[PDB]
Amino acid sequence: VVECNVKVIFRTNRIAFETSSTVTKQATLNQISNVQTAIGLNKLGWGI
Amino acid sequence: VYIIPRPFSNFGKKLSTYTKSHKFMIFGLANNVIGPTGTGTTAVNRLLTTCLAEIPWQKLPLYMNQSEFDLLPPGSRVVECNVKVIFRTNRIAFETSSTVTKQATLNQISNVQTAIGLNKLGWGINRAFTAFQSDQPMIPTATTAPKYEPVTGDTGYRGMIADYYGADSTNDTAFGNAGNYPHHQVSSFTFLQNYYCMYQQTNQGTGGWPCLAEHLQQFDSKTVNNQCLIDVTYKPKMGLIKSPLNYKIIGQPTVKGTISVGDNLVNMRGAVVTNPPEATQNVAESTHNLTRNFPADLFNIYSDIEKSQVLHKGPWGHENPQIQPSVHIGIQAVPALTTGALLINSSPLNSWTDSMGYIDVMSSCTVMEAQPTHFPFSTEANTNPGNTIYRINLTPNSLTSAFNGLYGNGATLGN
Amino acid sequence: VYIIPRPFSNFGKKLSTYTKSHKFMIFGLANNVIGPTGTGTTAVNRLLTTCLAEIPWQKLPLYMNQSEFDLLPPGSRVVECNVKVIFRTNRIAFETSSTVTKQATLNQISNVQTAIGLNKLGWGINRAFTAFQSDQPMIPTATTAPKYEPVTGDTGYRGMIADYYGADSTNDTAFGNAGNYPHHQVSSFTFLQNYYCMYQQTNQGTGGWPCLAEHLQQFDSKTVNNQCLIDVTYKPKMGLIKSPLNYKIIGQPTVKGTISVGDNLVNMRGAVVTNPPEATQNVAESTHNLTRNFPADLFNIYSDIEKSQVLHKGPWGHENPQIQPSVHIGIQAVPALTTGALLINSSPLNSWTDSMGYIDVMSSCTVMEAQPTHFPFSTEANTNPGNTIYRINLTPNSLTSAFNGLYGNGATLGN
Amino acid sequence: VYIIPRPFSNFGKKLSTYTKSHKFMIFG
């Protein structure tokens, strides 16, 4: 293998809608989410 | 000098045009869990399924209705005909039910996908209309002969023609608070009753599912939205769509001295041809071809309702003593199925949110012709063998496009 | 907008090249007293002989050896291949013997002669290897099937392959103080074991010996010396030199719905063809042709040592459902035989001074190919009928070039 | 002068390429 690449696009995310009122979890049309990417960590840092 | 000027009968050419704004609807058929052999006859075979709905830009009725077709003079041929479609939008459900699995969401991620040649050109089959599943009901289940004409097990379903146009001022089955509506004539949505898929069996030949993905494009719907993604057209290689013109038998010696044999040594090829691939194998195939040549002049259609008959007849209508080949391209519009929000535990993906796309399609075509006569008392339109036209008959279907290529259409009937 | 970019598997193409400096030797075969029928089967026929040695720029081994050939992937085809030769010089004997006739001389008059197309294109036959004469021993005597591969009456002589390359680290017959040497690999002269000549019988057809002289050029050797007189090349019309690529049987309807018949009305020619000249006569000939068309897909080679198999296979390998023709040109290098100084009384010319020419020949070629696969789990390289290739089989040899043209090679075996 | 030109076997290099559009899903 000479070189090999990956490119990714945050095509989008989807978050649920509590109908259930139940619990706790108040139902909302609001949405606050946030992507997070990372590279070397894996190999290079302190993890698994 | 003084030349006495000759006569002339210039027979003009009618050339019409037709259009129609169809409002088609597709469903996001969940990347159709392949159904094994649609028939108890091919039993050991399967169909990888797509939602790629098929726009019948080859069945005459997409372009014109009964009358318009009905009224075309003999020798009427479709010149060119086009389709342009607009991803007018798609709609995806909203799980209220919490039930199951399928977490309720105001989110939405869907994506259009169109494709052209695949059909005809690639390795697949249009097998559609179907028979299928309960909630998370987008994958389907019963294959079936694709429906263009109307089908019936005494009750009947369908009628492309009537789907777009309604019935006759008198026809019962339609007309009615509740029966077969004029749709097109009064804007209505109607579905694109055929989707497309790929066939393949088990052992007499084998290696895996080829890659559709690299033969159809996919857009982020919302992006491509309200924008037209189709607009390809076809100028049929031979679209004589009404019984041809009769050449008249009134010349002279032997060619009407008698109705005998008038044959001659030309030294140039003049008959239609045939390939018969001898597939035989013992762990991956071994073929053999044998060109078969054959005849010519008997008719083109009959039932009159053979408007629901195919368009490009390049493989059987040899015009005059010569030859040629080619297949009408094919075209598909649709949205990959929206996946349910199946939380946590899904580590199979098989829950599918119902979603329907409203694709706006306009179809048009030309077809045209002459009505000449070269004999003073001859009744009918008339020409000469110079062209006369000629068909090439066979026991079964001629190139049954409802079953996959080898570029031209095999002449036999699938599933 | 946002199109999701499709996949791609670009399978690269291996393209190699090969060369080799062969050191060939020719003899001035005395304008070969024609030998009557080399076989007790054609008994009444003859061969006007030339010294024109044949450079086998058509037998794969002239270009590459075992391994290189051996290691070519399926679908490997020779692209082009060339030969250039240099009249490195010739040597003529010196009669010491006074004996006979042949007056001793430090004089020398010799002359090179080369020729191209003759072979294939003209009216002759490569019949060589031979069986011959005592001093003034350049004319020869026994015709014989030309040797490229190895021949044997249990003892064996030859091996083009091994002549150039030697044996295997273990093979006895070679390797040894004295057995089958690596020649090429360690510069050695070796002979051009085939010379060329013309055939012709007695009564079923007749008029005399045509004129070779006007189909080969002759130089004053010494002039042309150490200068290359050949350098022509051939780009084979169809040089698939390794078993082709298998088209896989995994598309869909009928084409694998079953392994049945999938045939179709194309209306275009798609099968290989055949001429069968009906030579019949009563004092100079009378012919009749009858085009025969035929089949296609079974294999290309087997014994693996079919590297000693021919190069341009234009008359039998139809690639995909279509067609074509043509023959690899042919090439000859040599010196007209030096005449003895046969004084006074010679009023027949038949005394010939032994002389040998060292012609320096370099051969090269390209051959190349791909190794693609379009099915996810398919084992082997694989393509599609789109091309698949197809051979056309027969009982005897296909175009047995070792017996003279009619441009293409008759398919039957001579002498 | 006159050098007799040596042989040569240039073995070419296959060099392919591959791609694929995967559609992956993550959970928060």
XYZ file of C-alpha atoms in Angstrom, chain C residues 8-16 73-76 245 368-374 381, chain D residues 12-18:
29
model
C -13.462 3.558 -8.053
C -11.076 0.738 -8.485
C -8.561 1.644 -11.042
C -6.683 -1.437 -11.865
C -3.302 -0.523 -13.217
C -1.562 -2.034 -16.224
C 1.678 -3.941 -16.089
C 3.702 -3.251 -19.111
C 7.071 -4.926 -19.409
C -0.795 -12.637 -16.056
C -3.827 -13.744 -18.027
C -4.815 -11.442 -20.839
C -1.137 -10.762 -21.387
C -9.573 -13.103 -18.928
C 1.434 -6.027 -20.904
C -1.961 -6.308 -19.164
C -4.382 -5.648 -16.298
C -5.781 -7.786 -13.457
C -9.204 -6.254 -12.619
C -12.103 -7.526 -10.707
C -15.552 -6.236 -10.587
C -9.327 -11.601 -12.425
C 6.701 -2.996 -15.227
C 4.873 -1.962 -12.074
C 1.193 -2.452 -11.473
C -0.183 0.384 -9.533
C -3.867 0.351 -8.710
C -6.193 2.557 -6.679
C -9.208 2.023 -4.645
